[PDB]
Each structure stands twice: as C-alpha cells, then as structure tokens.
C-alpha cells in the first residue's frame, strides 16, 4: 500500500561536558532502518535492519559524512537559538527535527514535511503547500524570514518531492519482504483475587507484531465501555509486543464475560473466556 | 538519503 521515509533528528547540548550529542535516526514505514549516534566510539551511519546491509560502502561513507556535516550545522544552530531566546550558555537544550515524505500506493506524493522543535515545543514547520512556513513564536519568525529570504523551502521541497521519494523507492525494494513480517498474538486470560464480591479477569495478548492491536471485553454479546483497565502496548524487547485488558466482574459471573482480540496477523478475531 | 539541513 502507502509508504514513507522519515528522519528523526536530535541535537542535545551538554554544557562544558563535551560537544552536543547528535543523533539521526532513519525510518521506513515506521521501522528504524538506519542510525547515527555521535556519542558512539568512532561514529558511523550503521544499518539498523538486515535488508539494509546490501548497500555499498560508498553509500555508508556518503551518509556518514552527511551526518557529520549536519552535526556541525546543528552545533551552530543551538548557539544561535541560545541567542534568539537570550538563554544562559550554561544550560542544556535540545533541537529535534522530523523530515520526510509519505507516498501513496500510486507512487505519488501524499505529504512531504519538515518540523523543528526546541526543548519539546514546536519551533517552525513547512506547510502543506511545501512553499510557505509557519513560525510558532518570535524566535521561529527569525528563522522563518531568513529561510524565506534564501529560498530554503524551494530547496527543501525539491528534496521532499524527488530525492526523498526515489530513496524511499530504493529502500523498499531491498526490504519490502522484511517490512511485511507479521506475528500473531497468543492470548490467555487470568483470574485475580481482588478481595470482595468481585474478581479481575485479565486478557493477555503476547508476542505479536506490528504493535497495532485491539483488545475488548464483552458481557453476553454486549460490549464494555466502562472501567476497562488497559496498558499502553509495550515492547517485549525481542521484536514483538504485548498488551492486556481487564475488568472486575461479579464473582460467579465469570463465564458471562468474553474477551476479543483483533490483529492484522490473525486469520480471524480470536475469542477468550478464561478456563478454570 | 539524508537532507542537507540549513541554519536556524
């Protein structure tokens, strides 16, 4: 279907504790596929996914020197902002950037973009039109006006519509196979003390991928919309994820409640009950 | 492929 290539960049300063830490992470369809950390010994632009190891050392050297160069401009920007905001040089700060494009199954551009953030707050963004900017405060206006006066958007656009796309095309060919991987969840239910006239039933789903999943409880066909306990889908630390949901049902009435699990990997939405 | 970021 649709795909996208993005780059998440962070530049964080460590006042009088060395140079700022620069990290550029690359994603394809939300899957990290390349990375560059400056705090690594002899920094290199490492391939994060196997299907990437099929690129020539020429590419790896190119992208490494690109990052190093960006790491430099960023080291400068940090100081520039420091002055836009009149902030002590002694405090630490952060610049984050998100750049990339999202293309449709037709291979056409659906949305390109570039957003900046300073200390966790949106700084400036490139608009839908890929021609204008939107500043989020007095400081960003300066960058805005400069970038207007320099044609930055035009150059940036040129990258989002072309360079960025073509490379998304190339990465996908070498790794679509892998990007299709899917792991169906395994589910079981658990009964819990919960002292009183009630009990807790926890519906577990583990070892699944992608992280997208939905867990829901039912009482004799009708669905439960209240007092459902859920936990943010979490990484099992082995490529797969896990998540659970629970409800405190009146004791005895265990059977009357059933759990449901929907996941693109499953051939069909499994149904759990808890079996004594 | 990365973008050549400019200055803020």
């Amino acid at each position: 279907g649709p795909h996208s290539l993005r780059y998440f960049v962070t530049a964080v300063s460590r006042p009088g504790l060395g140079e700022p830490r620069f990290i550029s992470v690359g994603y394809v369809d939300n899957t990290e596929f390349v990375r560059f950390d400056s705090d690594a010994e002899n920094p290199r632009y490492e391939p994060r996914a196997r299907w990437m190891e099929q690129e020539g050392p020429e590419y790896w050297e190119r992208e490494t020197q690109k990052a190093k160069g960006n790491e430099q401009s960023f080291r400068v920007d940090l100081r520039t902002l420091l002055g836009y905001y009149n902030q002590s040089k002694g405090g630490s700060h952060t610049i984050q950037v998100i750049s990339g494009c999202e293309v449709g199954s037709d291979g056409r551009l659906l949305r390109g973009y570039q957003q900046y953030a300073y200390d966790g707050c949106d700084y400036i963004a490139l608009n839908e039109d890929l021609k204008t900017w939107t500043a989020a405060d007095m400081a960003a206006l300066i960058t805005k006006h400069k970038w207007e006066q320099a044609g930055e958007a035009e150059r940036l656009r040129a990258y989002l519509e072309g360079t960025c796309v073509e490379w998304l095309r190339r990465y996908l060919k070498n790794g679509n196979a892998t990007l299709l991987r899917t792991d169906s969840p395994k589910a079981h239910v658990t009964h819990h003390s919960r002292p009183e006239d009630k009990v807790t039933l926890r519906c577990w789903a583990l070892g699944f991928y992608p992280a997208d999943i939905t867990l829901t409880w039912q009482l004799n066909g009708e669905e439960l919309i209240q007092d459902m306990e859920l936990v943010e889908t979490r990484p099992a630390g082995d490529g797969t994820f896990q998540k659970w949901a629970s409800v405190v049902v009146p004791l005895g009435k265990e059977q009357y409640y059933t759990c449901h699990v929907y996941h693109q990997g499953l051939p069909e939405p499994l149904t759990l009950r808890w079996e004594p | 492929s990365q973008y050549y970021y400019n200055s803020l």
């Epitope: 690109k66 160069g69 430099q72 | 050549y4």
Partner: T-cell receptor
Framework: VTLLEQNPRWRLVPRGQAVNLRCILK??????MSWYQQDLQKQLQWLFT????????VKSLPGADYLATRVTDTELRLQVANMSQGRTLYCTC??????????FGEGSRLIVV | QKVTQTQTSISVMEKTTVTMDCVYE???????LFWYKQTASGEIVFLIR??????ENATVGHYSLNFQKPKSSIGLIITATQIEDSAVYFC??????????????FGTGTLLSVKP
C-alpha cells in the same frame, strides 16, 4: 554600504615574511565567513569556512601555509606564512550554511618583493 | 567536480550578443551554478545564479543562462553589452556535500573585452 572590511588592503613583502590579514563583518545577517585565495593566474580557490568564535583551522596550498581563526562573531583572521609567490586573499560572508548568497570582500593583495 | 571555461578571452563589439560557455561536473542530485564578475579594481561581483532543480533558465538584468542539465552546460548570455561589462567572468558551481555550502568551485575565468 559594504558588508566586510578587509585589511590590510595590500601588502608588499619579502618572500617568507609572515603576514596577518583581518576581516571585519559589518552585518550580522551574514555570519558565515570564509577565506578564498586567488593566485597570480586569477584562479579563485576556497580555503576555510569558520562560523563559530573559536574555530581554528590550517591548510597548505602550493606557495603558502595558512592559519585562520574566527576570533569573534565579527572578526575572522588569517595568517599567511612561508609565502613564495604572490596571491590575494578574499574574505567572504554568507547568510547561512548553505551559502548561495556569498559576497566577496575587497581582498588583501599580497605582493612578494 | 570539474567546472571548466574553455575561452581564455572573448573580444566583441558593444551592443552585441556574447555567449560565454561553462561546462561542469557534479554527482549531487541538487546543486547551484553561479556567474561572477571581477573588474580592474579587483572586486568580485555576483551576477546571476541557477538552481539545478528548475527546468527554466534563470534571468536577471540583461544576463541569461542557457542551462542544459543533460549536457552539464550553463553558459552566460550577456545581451546589449557595453564598455562597463568588460571584465573577467568566472563561472562557479557550489557542490560537494558537508564541507561545502560556502565552498564554491570556480572556473579558470574568461576575460570579456567589449570593443566600443
């Protein structure tokens, strides 16, 4: 009405005598400064680009050994040493890292006497 | 990264169309072509620029470029020349990536002589 102030404008010197050039930025909108050499054949070549106060760097082209430093946000220096042939040094300023809008100063014509 | 200008010198009458060639080389997908002027006083002056990602030829003053991406050519076209245009025209391309930006690569230079 000019962006950079380059000094000394010219210099006559006996081969080997070291020479100190200085460049002054008269506009905060072009903090990206660089050094360019133009040899006696009128050929321009880039030497350095120092953006931050503190940045030091050396390079050696045939005929001269250089050493430039971005002393302050407004002062960029250069130290020409062991000069064997004439050359004129150009100081340049640009709005940002990308460039594409670099203005050349008047230069520092250095002559070997 | 070999921007070259073959013409050592060009002498032509005023009010005449003169075209100064410049061939270039770069691997970068995006880049920038430039044309500068130097006078007897010894000062360089920016004339016009070209953006690799614009299919149309740039235009400023009476200067015009014949950008031909497929043939890496980007000559300068000075129309209705005059006694002031007489100077040395340099052709330059900004390109390498990272340690470039403010690193232009200049051509050998071509001296235009506009005969009155």
């Amino acid at each position: 009405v000019t962006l950079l102030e380059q000094n000394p404008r010219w210099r006559l010197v006996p081969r080997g005598q070291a020479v100190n050039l200085r460049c002054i930025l008269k506009n905060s909108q072009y903090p990206w400064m660089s050094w360019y050499q133009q040899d006696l054949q009128k050929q321009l070549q880039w030497l350095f680009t120092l953006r931050s106060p503190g940045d030091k760097e050396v390079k050696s082209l045939p005929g001269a050994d250089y050493l430039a430093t971005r002393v302050t946000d407004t002062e960029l220096r250069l130290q020409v040493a062991n000069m064997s042939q004439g050359r004129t040094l150009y100081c340049t300023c640009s709005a940002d890292r990308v460039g594409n809008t670099l203005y050349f100063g008047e230069g520092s014509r250095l002559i070997v006497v | 990264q070999k921007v070259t200008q073959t013409q050592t010198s060009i002498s032509v009458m005023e009010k005449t169309t003169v075209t100064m060639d410049c061939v270039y080389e770069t691997q970068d997908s995006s880049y920038f072509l430039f044309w500068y002027k130097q006078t007897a006083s010894g000062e360089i002056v920016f004339l016009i620029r070209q953006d690799s990602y614009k299919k149309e030829n740039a235009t400023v003053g009476h200067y015009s470029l014949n950008f031909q991406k497929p043939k890496s050519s980007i000559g300068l076209i000075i129309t209705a020349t005059q006694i002031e245009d007489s100077a040395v025209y340099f052709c330059a391309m900004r390109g390498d990536y990272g340690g470039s930006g403010n690193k232009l690569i200049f051509g050998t230079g071509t001296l235009l002589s506009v005969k009155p």
